[PDB]
Symmetry: C4
Amino acid sequence: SIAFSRAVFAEFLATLLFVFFGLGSALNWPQALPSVLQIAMAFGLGIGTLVQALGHISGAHINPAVTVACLVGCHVSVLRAAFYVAAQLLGAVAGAALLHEITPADIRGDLAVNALSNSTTAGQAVTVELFLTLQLVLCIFASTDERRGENPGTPALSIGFSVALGHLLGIHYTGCSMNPARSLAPAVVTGKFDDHWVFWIGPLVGAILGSLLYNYVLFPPAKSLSERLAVLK
Amino acid sequence: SIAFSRAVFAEFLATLLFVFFGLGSALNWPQALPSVLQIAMAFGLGIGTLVQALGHISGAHINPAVTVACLVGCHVSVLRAAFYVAAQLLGAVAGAALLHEITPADIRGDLAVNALSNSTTAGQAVTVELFLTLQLVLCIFASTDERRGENPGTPALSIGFSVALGHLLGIHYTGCSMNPARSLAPAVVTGKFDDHWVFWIGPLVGAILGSLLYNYVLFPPAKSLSERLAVLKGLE
Amino acid sequence: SELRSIAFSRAVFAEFLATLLFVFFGLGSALNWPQALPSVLQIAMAFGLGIGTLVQALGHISGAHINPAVTVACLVGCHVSVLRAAFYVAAQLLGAVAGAALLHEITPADIRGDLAVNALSNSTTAGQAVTVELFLTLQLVLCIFASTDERRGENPGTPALSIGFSVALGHLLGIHYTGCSMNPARSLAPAVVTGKFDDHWVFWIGPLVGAILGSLLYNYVLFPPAKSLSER
Amino acid sequence: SELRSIAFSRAVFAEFLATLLFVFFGLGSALNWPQALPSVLQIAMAFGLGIGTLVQALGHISGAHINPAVTVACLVGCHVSVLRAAFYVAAQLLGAVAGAALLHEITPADIRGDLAVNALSNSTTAGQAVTVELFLTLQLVLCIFASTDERRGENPGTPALSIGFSVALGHLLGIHYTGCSMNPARSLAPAVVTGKFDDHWVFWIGPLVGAILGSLLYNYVLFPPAKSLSERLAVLKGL
Ligand SMILES: [Zn+2]
């Protein structure tokens, strides 16, 4: 019960730091405007650092889509999943509110809200988000799969570079979400809810798809005591 | 029986995601045109992520030239090699067709097709493509070698950074191929086939060269007794 | 012991040489070169790969702190004597100023400029800036503490690259506010060399409070030592 | 003898091929400036990922020095014989010139230019430049020695990435002063091909002195090997 509180607090603090660093590096700085690689790197090294710092404490999900993928995959409970999602949404909004406070009003702008970009339709955008989140979930699962042992070698860096990879494509379409908490945080703070469902449906469907594809298509477990049913039939 | 189907599906899905992410990061030019480092990084982190995610399930070739190189020192049969190459070509075209569908019409353009750049001749270009794939094949062979030292595990980041390295040079000459499936995918979707043989001959010759150089010249592997007999009995 | 004695001298010398090289490379890459002005990613990468290279090269010799704020975090956290902490902080401040003085004498006079001093940027107030510096150093210590946690013995992990990328991460945000410090020695070094002490306390209070916060958060809240025989 | 063994021939060939590929990729990414001029980070990354890839591919075969300064650092630090050191240096210089000559052949005449030769930049004096080159090669050699240190536990690939990022780090500073050498073979290769030898001694004295300094500092001052079989047990009793 104490260990669970430490895990929920870690999930809160991780999303707080991720959103604070992520959005802050993505803001329109007039003296030196951030590049697609620079932003991809900020979110990428953000996740990679927090997985390194907090992975052994909570699993370092830092994303409700990842927690949901984990609910379908990891032997996690619906109780832990709810407490994690709630901690991530609270941590994210706290990170976006904290950043607002420390950033001068002139720069703040859209506070790096997820917005449909380059005349992309919501239907085209929801499809990108699905694939952006699918590849992250595939990588996260492979990097943390206990059956693999110490073989992944670089889980934090791999997971981090997967977030960066998502951003190198995603930025052009939606500003890149892959995370419902990262989307809700600046949307709640700076009132902007433009096609918000895309940043929820996309990541969540992509995460569930990736979780089902990994755990039951690509690398499923061996047959359980359900084989006794096939013997009885 | 199931394991082989899972491996072929992984090879298909890996090339689908690689081509989708790779090309998509190389086109997308509004009031933010992608840089050589940005593109190198997209293809590089693309392969690295996919080797990490799918290596343990298929070997994560994601390249017909890599599968061909592996036909000499990866314990890949001609049957598996054919099924992998077919899965990669199908996955790649599916990734390029999917990207076309999701990208607004005006941005699409060439769809990041491999094309001769900065007035480079096809002969000069095919030589670049040979060396770009030779170093990649050299890195994959060492990275998957039990004798390379370290602890068990595949360095997915090392392989990824080899792809990025290839792009830092290759972009200027051909838009960097190193992968015949990555070349065919936007060529089939768009209809552009200008100097298409360079993107097949270059990676394939470079891969076979790197495979022969590693396995016969540089670090000849330890033969099992059955393999050794395939050589001995397969003489006089 | 004699063996134990040489080891401490090697550690203090490594901390000196590490801060010398870090400040020399870091500031030098951040200078306003006219032919090619450095980008936020380029600078983040210079300081990032700087710490990562030094952690790789010197970690097994001193712990590769290269920062008085992290040295202070090991005092409250990874419980070390006040003697080593003082010798490390003194070595880092000496190494840093030596690195900044060496760089000054290596760069032509025209391009030296402000010598990459930490300065309040984009009209950020000192109070807003000290809050940024707190959070930049907090994430760094959290990452350092986990990468070097005694309990993380077995699998080596990637401490040098991870720590390196955590410094780069802090720069991708921090550059816009203060030019990014996260390190009181990196701030003092060009300030002593080129007399520019504008809002200097921010670059001391920010990193130090952030480091102590991260050390207390890791050792008392997040991952404390086991209180009893329950799990030891 | 060492000379008449297959393994030694493979190591010398590996050192030749590594310098060939390094110089070919490195210079080519630094000179290619038509309607897309390369940035300091882009070039740093090309040379950086170049060394990292080659250390990964060839490290287990020859030690992947790809640099006469590194070979010299290893000579001073008792890792290689004077015979192997000579054969490595000769292979690196031959490989480098072959890599620059090959690149010249494949690059259109309009973009070749000075072929990314090391040249004193931003009005830096040769004395200031030789001091930079010393510190660039010193940190590199410090990283190489730790990355190939049997006493240090690491995960697969990470030592080659660390050496690679050390080369990039050097370039992020060095580019502004000399175009960043850290390697006498990388300097000689386009100088022989293009015919430009302006302040060439800096690119030899700088890296060689920096490498010897780093080798002596690591092996004698910072982290020397054990002297006795009882040394590690003598440390253990301090609990
Ligand atoms: Zn050596």
